[PDB]
Ligand binder design. Structure first.
Ligand SMILES: O=C(N[C@@H](C(=O)NO)c1ccc(-c2cc(F)c(F)c(F)c2)cc1)[C@@H](F)C(F)(F)F
Ligand SMILES: [Mg+2]
Ligand SMILES: [Mg+2]
Ligand SMILES: [Mg+2]
Ligand SMILES: [Mg+2]
Ligand SMILES: [Zn+2]
Length: 889
């Protein structure tokens, strides 16, 4: 099993200057003819010519138009084509081949495949080798000349990278299109699409060069009415890159294409971005609210890759975070500016500290630039993406906007048209740092540890105030726990955005201040501090760390009410919740262990409940923020703070705390649920797909959150509200009516009603499936069986499989049933999926990531299912590799 090491990078002994492809699509097979115009590099030492080529059927291979013969001049083992060096030319030469591949039965959705009636490619990371022979690595840059042919009736729309330079008819009802793409590119950015596609289009005129860019968004005919918001988002993306970064699109045309079957969200193929339909298509009648921000982020994300990934590309795959962490960061800047809601940044942090923190304290922990890999298909992680983005964002926090923009432009101008590494980016940032600090002696060498060191730093605080001296001190410590990647962890460059709040009037006591913590510990002192402040720490979540604020709940409540920073207010609330959760958890655990007949629980802080009421009742406060404060921290955030977590005891703990708060605030909840209706459910723009109001959507989130709290509580006659909610035109509302009805006799009536509403739109039905999957039902296993038999069946669509099973795995009480029946069920699905799509099978492993954090019975149960999956004779490379790492084997 080949392990690739970052330190082993060496450039190829060969060069590929030109790729000329003929892709001929037929009913039962696809024939690919390829001529590679090649050369010998200065690094060549007379080695064999070895091409990647996976699952290819060879019809012929030639060098300089001379047929090569198997055995004597070459060998092929279904993974590598080896041409013996005595037969390899010493100067420029042409290599040609004709292979047969079979998109129809390509269910792994890598290489060239069929999604419904669309032929489509996915080449990142090493999928191009499933299409034709190549030296399949991103430093092998080449020009591409691509001809596609196909039955005209089935496949009237033909697309690839570059300009369409010819279209022609072919005898027998066929037709072709030729695309020439002169700029050099790595092969993972090659794409081809063929199908009966329908489109919306527009023309965009660039800000500075005033170039006309044609924008096309494509889908199957059935869903063409769902393309409009995507086009709006594309225009928005282009404008933001122009306005913030001064960057314009360089090509005459940009195509976005939705396909039903896709392993991830989307792919940034040059001039031909290809999307999971769930991340490109929406309409207000047929999509939940979440689709709108999803499409905005994903369209934005693929667009921003045109610079950070496409024009400036990767030397090697170990540099993945250089294009993904940076493009996620650009996408976050964009979406924050587009939505103008504080919950956009909060939602990113919420995801990082639950999902990515879990990963980073799991056996799978890695730095954002790993040292090795076996499977690229398993490399695309929340660590590389989301911790990557936080590391890219810290440069902005450290430099400020002006010098960050200067540094970023240095990176682009210096590396445009080339491969690059993480060091190139740090170097560019460092140049800006020298300018900002006004001495060329300043450096960011310590910053590189963010790329190489794994694990989440813990940052903790102590304070001192001298009332006579008017002198305030913040003592800060950082610590990262040793793990498998470093025995000794080094201190990082941690930027701490801080404010000081006057507790008497809630005002700022100092100007904007970013503490630069560069040692294991430091003391930051402030003079002329007139009164003892409450510190506002890591404003905007200014570093990806565990924050231990060492504040009292009284101080935290003051910040929650009066601080200026949304994240610190949100975090202060989170910290109050966590102190309560840990306390009640231990009390419940003790009662369980000692088999107590009676015991006490510590009630929720009443001033805290009063603070929530205060904020909820404030008509000038933000609805999205309001929905965060009435929600306990995510289970996957909580689990980072508890050893041997008994999921039952945690379920009882959450139940107690929600009941405590609802016993005081339910009337407030109910009043708000009713008063929010007019604005939240306003239909004025329901038939305008260009009008998206993120505040209004946050009001609906708040109503739907409140409705859930009231339904769980069995608030008097809340079922009436539920039934009326089911008649709302907004799918976020009527799907919510299904999940909250779980607590009532009406559940299966709403199940049928909402099914009938959902069944004729592919993506809406997947949303319905998710809603059922995550329904708080005691009969949820019986319900899942019904979904399998009646709706899911033997679908190989990753959207269908993920929709049915993943939401259920977050059911704390039932997925973690002490019998192990939920672990058994998800392992059976993983093994079944692994037969045809190893990448998605490993995605479906996600609930096992925390296995060694649970109580010892559940650790044993999970480990048993993982060992069972590992023992499957036909297990894929992906899944084997992943489970071996996860189980510390
Ligand atoms: O869709 C995502 N990421 C893709 C991306 O970065 N688009 O710009 C992405 C694209 C391709 C792959 C990928 C990697 C492989 F190794 C494959 F085999 C494969 F089929 C897809 C993974 C993630 C999500 F991270 C996002 F962006 F949040 F939606
Ligand atoms: Mg094959
Ligand atoms: Mg503009
Ligand atoms: Mg389908
Ligand atoms: Mg290990
Ligand atoms: Zn990306």
């Amino acid at each position: 099993p080949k392990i690739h090491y970052r330190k082993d990078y060496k450039p190829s002994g060969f060069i590929i200057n030109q790729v000329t492809l003929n892709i001929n699509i037929h009913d039962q097979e696809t024939i690919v003819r390829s001529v590679l115009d090649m050369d010998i590099s200065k690094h060549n030492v007379g080695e064999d010519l070895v091409f990647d080529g996976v699952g290819l059927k060879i019809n012929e291979i030639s060098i300089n138009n001379k047929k090569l013969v198997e055995g004597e001049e070459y060998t092929y083992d279904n993974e590598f084509l080896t041409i013996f060096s005595k037969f390899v030319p010493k100067s420029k030469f042409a290599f040609s081949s004709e292979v047969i591949i079979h998109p129809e039965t390509n269910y792994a959705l890598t290489g060239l495949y069929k999604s419904k009636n669309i032929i489509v490619s996915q080449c990142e990371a090493t999928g191009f080798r499933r299409i034709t022979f190549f030296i399949d690595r991103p430093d092998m840059m080449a020009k591409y000349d691509v001809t596609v042919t196909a039955d005209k009736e089935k496949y009237p729309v033909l697309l690839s990278n570059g300009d369409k330079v010819n279209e022609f008819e072919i005898p027998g009802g066929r037709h072709g299109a030729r695309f020439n793409d002169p700029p050099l590119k790595p092969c993972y950015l090659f794409a081809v699409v063929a199908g009966d596609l329908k489109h919306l289009s527009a023309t965009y005129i660039t800000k500075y060069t005033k170039k006309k860019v044609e924008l096309y968004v494509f889908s199957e005919e059935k869903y063409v009415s769902k393309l409009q918001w995507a086009l709006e988002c594309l225009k928005k993306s282009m404008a933001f890159d122009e306005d913030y970064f001064g960057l314009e699109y360089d090509l005459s045309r940009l195509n976005l294409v939705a396909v039903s079957d896709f392993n991830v969200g989307a792919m940034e193929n040059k001039g031909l971005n290809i999307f999971n339909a769930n991340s490109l298509l929406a309409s207000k009648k047929n999509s939940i609210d979440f689709s709108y921000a999803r499409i905005l982020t994903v369209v934005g994300h693929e667009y921003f890759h045109q610079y950070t990934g496409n024009r400036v590309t990767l030397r090697d795959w170990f540099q993945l975070t250089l294009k993904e962490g940076l493009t996620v960061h650009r996408e976050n800047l964009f979406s924050e500016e587009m939505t103008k809601t504080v919950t956009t940044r909060l939602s990113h942090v919420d995801l990082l500290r639950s999902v990515q923190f879990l990963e980073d304290s799991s056996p799978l922990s890695h730095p954002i630039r790993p040292e090795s890999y076996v499977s690229m298909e398993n490399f695309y992680t929340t660590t590389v993406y989301d911790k990557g983005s936080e590391v890219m964002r810290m440069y902005l926090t450290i430099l400020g906007e002006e010098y960050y923009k200067k540094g970023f432009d240095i990176y682009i101008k210096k590396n445009d048209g080339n491969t690059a590494t993480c060091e190139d980016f740090n170097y560019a940032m460092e140049q800006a740092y020298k300018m900002k600090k006004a001495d060329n002696s300043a450096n960011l060498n310590q910053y590189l540890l963010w790329f190489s060191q794994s694990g989440t730093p813990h940052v903790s605080f102590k304070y001192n105030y001298d009332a006579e001296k008017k002198q305030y001190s913040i003592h800060v410590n950082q610590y990262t726990k040793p793990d498998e990647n470093q025995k000794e962890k080094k201190p990082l460059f941690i930027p701490i955005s801080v404010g000081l709040i006057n507790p008497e009037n809630g005002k700022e006591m100092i100007s904007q201040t970013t503490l630069e913590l560069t040692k294991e510990s430091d003391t930051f002192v402030f003079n002329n501090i007139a009164v003892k402040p409450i510190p506002s720490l890591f404003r905007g979540f200014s570093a990806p760390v565990y924050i231990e604020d060492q504040l009292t709940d009284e101080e935290r409540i003051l910040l929650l009410k009066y601080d200026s920073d949304a994240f610190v207010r949100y975090n202060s609330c989170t910290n109050i919740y966590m102190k309560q959760i840990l306390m009640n958890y231990n009390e419940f655990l003790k009662a369980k262990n000692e088999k107590l007949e009676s015991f006490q629980l510590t009630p929720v802080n009443a001033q805290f409940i009063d603070a929530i009421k205060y904020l909820l009742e404030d008509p000038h406060a933000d609805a999205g923020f309001k929905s965060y404060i009435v929600s306990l921290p995510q289970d996957r955030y909580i689990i980072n703070f508890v050893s041997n977590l008994d999921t039952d005891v945690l379920a009882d703990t959450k139940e107690y705390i929600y009941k405590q708060i609802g016993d005081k605030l339910n009337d407030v909840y109910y009043k708000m649920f009713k008063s929010l209706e007019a604005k939240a459910d306003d239909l004025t723009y329901f038939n305008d797909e260009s009008h998206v109001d993120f505040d209004q959507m946050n009001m609906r989130t708040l109503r739907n959150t409140l409705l859930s709290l009231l339904s769980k509580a069995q608030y008097p006659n809340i079922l009436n509200e539920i039934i009326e909610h089911s008649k709302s035109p907004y799918p976020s509302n009527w799907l919510t009516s299904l999940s909250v009805s779980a607590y009532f006799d009406k559940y299966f009536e709403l199940y049928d009603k909402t099914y009938k509403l959902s069944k004729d739109d592919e993506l809406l039905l997947q949303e319905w499936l998710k809603t059922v999957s995550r329904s708080d039902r005691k009969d949820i296993y019986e319900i899942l069986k019904k979904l399998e038999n009646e709706v899911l069946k033997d679908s190989k669509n990753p959207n269908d499989i993920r929709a049915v099973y993943l939401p259920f795995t977050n059911n704390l009480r039932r997925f973690h049933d002490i019998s192990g029946k939920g672990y058994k069920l998800i392992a059976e699905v993983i093994t079944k999926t692994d037969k045809f799509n190893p990448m998605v099978a490993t995605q479906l492993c996600e609930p096992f990531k925390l296995w060694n954090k649970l109580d010892t019975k559940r650790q044993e149960l999970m480990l048993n299912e993982m060992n069972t999956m590992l023992q499957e004779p036909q297990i894929s490379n992906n899944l084997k590799e992943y489970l071996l790492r996860l189980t510390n084997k």
